[PDB]
Amino acid sequence: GAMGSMERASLIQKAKLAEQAERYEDMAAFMKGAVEKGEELSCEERNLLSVAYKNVVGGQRAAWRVLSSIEQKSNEEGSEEKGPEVREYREKVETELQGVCDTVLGLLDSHLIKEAGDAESRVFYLKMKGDYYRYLAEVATGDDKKRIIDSARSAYQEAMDISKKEMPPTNPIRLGLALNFSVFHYEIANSPEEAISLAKTTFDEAMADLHTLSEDSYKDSTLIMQLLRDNLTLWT
Amino acid sequence: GAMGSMERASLIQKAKLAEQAERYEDMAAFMKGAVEKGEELSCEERNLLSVAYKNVVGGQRAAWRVLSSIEQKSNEEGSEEKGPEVREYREKVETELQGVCDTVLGLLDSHLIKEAGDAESRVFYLKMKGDYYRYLAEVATGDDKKRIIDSARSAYQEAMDISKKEMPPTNPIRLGLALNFSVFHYEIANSPEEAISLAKTTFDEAMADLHTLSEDSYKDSTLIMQLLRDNLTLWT
Amino acid sequence: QRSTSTPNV
Amino acid sequence: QRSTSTPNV
Ligand SMILES: *CC(=O)N1CC[C@@]2(CCN(S(=O)(=O)c3ccc(Br)c(F)c3)C2)C1
Ligand SMILES: *CC(=O)N1CC[C@@]2(CCN(S(=O)(=O)c3ccc(Br)c(F)c3)C2)C1
Ligand SMILES: [Cl-]
Ligand SMILES: [Cl-]
Ligand SMILES: [Mg+2]
Ligand SMILES: [Mg+2]
Ligand SMILES: [Mg+2]
Ligand SMILES: [Mg+2]
Ligand SMILES: [Mg+2]
Ligand SMILES: [Mg+2]
Ligand SMILES: [Mg+2]
Ligand SMILES: [Mg+2]
Secondary structure (H helix, E strand, C coil): CCCCCCCHHHHHHHHHHHHHHCCCCHHHHHHHHHHHCCCCHHHHHHHHHHHHHHHHHHHHHHHHHHHHHHHHCCCCCCCCCCHHHHHHHHHHHHHHHHHHHHHHHHHHHHHHHHHHHCHHHHHHHHHHHHHHHHHHHHHCCCCHHHHHHHHHHHHHHHHHHHHHHHHCCHCCCCCCCHHHHHHHHHCCCCCHHHHHHHHHHHHHHHHHHHHHHHHHHHHHHHHHHHHHHHHHHHHH | CCCCCCCCHEEEHHHEEEHHHHCHHHHHHHHHHHCCCCCCCCHHHHHHHHHHHHHHHHHHHHHHHHHHHHHHCCCCCCCCCCCCCHHHHHHHHHHHHHHHHHHHHHHHHHHHHHHHCCCHHHHHHHHHHHHHHHHHHHHCCCCCHHHHHHHHHHHHHHHHCCCCCCCCCHHHHHHHHHHHHHHHHHHHCCCCCHHHHHHHHHHHHHCCCHHHHHHHHHHHHHHHHHHHHHHHHHHH | CCCCCCCCC | CCCCCCCCC
């Protein structure tokens, strides 16, 4: 690995620099390098890892959607034949996206998840596992679409089980997990009623626990609650 | 070259797709591939080449500036020592930037410029040569800073000479060349008075030729004229 | 319109 | 503030 020769602390320092410079591919490579040092990650370090890869895959997802839409339009009546280029280029972007997802899932499997024993770490990593299977599901169109969906669901469910046992209802990791699992249900699993039910229950139980929080923790929880509400407005 | 096996028309088609998907590194690679087919480029194809590399280098320049500023701040009094990481990472970004500039200059030298005989093509390519030497100058801090600056100036001057002989004062390529040469004078060559004089003369001569234009050509010219004016406001 | 998932901090 | 150069079309 190209980062094998760089100190862990230096990789973290450079990931932060790359974040400031909006160099997210670099940021991801630095954080991969840090993970591969084999030490567990702190809360802040998990955040750097998450930000880096979310930005990389987010660019890929946006591009894939543009290309898929062009492709879909070319495969209708009245549409002039234009050769294999749109499909080829969509496939190229798709393959790169799957590559990034497989890299993240590889880090989680080797060995972030198994070493994570605290609730905050374990729930964060399992959420991440669900998210990156979800991204794979967005582009899957084969035998394995079903199995990918089940992998995402399994990761999210395991995370949900721990979060409900171990964290308060306002915990931001717990809230973001529930938000993303509700998106999984609505957008991937064709279960809009499960999506709405989860979003409603999560919102209501968080609302009732806000009183326990400091002003700063309150700010964090209510941010995610607003997104649950925005989705509920969208979905109903 | 990885694009050696793909048809020219396919490379152009995919560059346009990549533009739509905001995939500018891909767009640049496709257009490099097209250039390397050895045929002269059309006006639209020159635009694809220009857009792709401007976006790539523009990202690099923005990142380099962020990092240079952090670096500059770390090298003052009161500033805590933080090791080599900021300099290393700034150098990494710098090297990649220089690489892109050298790639573009390589395409122009092999063999876009020498095959360009029409004024629109020759002026466009020489402007580009000036621009990419200018970008190299922005990060140069050595013996060769002077020689890089002179290379940029030489390219711009050759372009200016052709443009004044061969194009009307409202020609958008002529206008953009003059805009960028005025930026060269102000930002790189420590010649703000030359910058202001060029911007003023260019603006005034274009103003006097607007009457000759169709509504669409008028739109194009006045866009660039506004930027000359915006700089003149900034500079005075 | 697509559903909103968790943003970056 | 930096000078404005030619934009992309
Ligand atoms: C402590 C810890 O492990 N953290 C805190 C930040 C983060 C990284 C990403 N998340 S998240 O996806 O659960 C999430 C993202 C955004 C927001 Br506003 C949020 F509250 C949570 C947890 C790792
Ligand atoms: C005909 C031709 O060779 N063209 C037209 C577009 C372009 C590509 C970039 N330029 S430019 O840098 O001279 C320029 C950029 C933006 C604008 Br609004 C403009 F008028 C000119 C010429 C190649
Ligand atoms: Cl392709
Ligand atoms: Cl580095
Ligand atoms: Mg060490
Ligand atoms: Mg037809
Ligand atoms: Mg595929
Ligand atoms: Mg542990
Ligand atoms: Mg051919
Ligand atoms: Mg001190
Ligand atoms: Mg250097
Ligand atoms: Mg020729």
